[PDB]
Amino acid sequence: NLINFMEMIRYTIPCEKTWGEYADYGCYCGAGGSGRPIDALDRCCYVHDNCYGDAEKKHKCNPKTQSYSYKLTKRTIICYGAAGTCARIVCDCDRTAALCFGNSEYIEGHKNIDTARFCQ
């Protein structure tokens, strides 16, 4: 569920940054993707799209809408979903993506990158 993902990101990316700086970054951060992730942070988004893809097919859930239980505390995130449900599968896709976002170097040079050039 988009709204939860954003809540999660808003909580792990460095304080000085914002969601918009993560919305259109590298080859995969944001809507869609192509090519290979250009750096570490892009890799986070690449593995996220993958996760959403394995949940929609292999597990028949609608990732961008799936409702679930997640808790933000101690600068971390915890999914309470029943270990196996779609709301839990999906929560884990977002949780590891959010945690990946906070621990990745944010390369200013890769934000808003030219897709036709760098993502072939």
Partner: protein, 61 residues
Amino acid sequence: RKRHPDCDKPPDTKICQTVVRAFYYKPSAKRCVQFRYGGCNGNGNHFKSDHLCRCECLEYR
């Protein structure tokens, strides 16, 4: 994100520029408070605002 490593050091009030209002974290009050920041950057316990300061220093229990 991680907690700012300087959140519990005393705020650097020395003068290296015209003074500006910033907030620093006070451990003995679990709050960010306003102070006269002088731009010497002896440590990073100084933020443009309260929100930014809580964000960087508030202790999660």
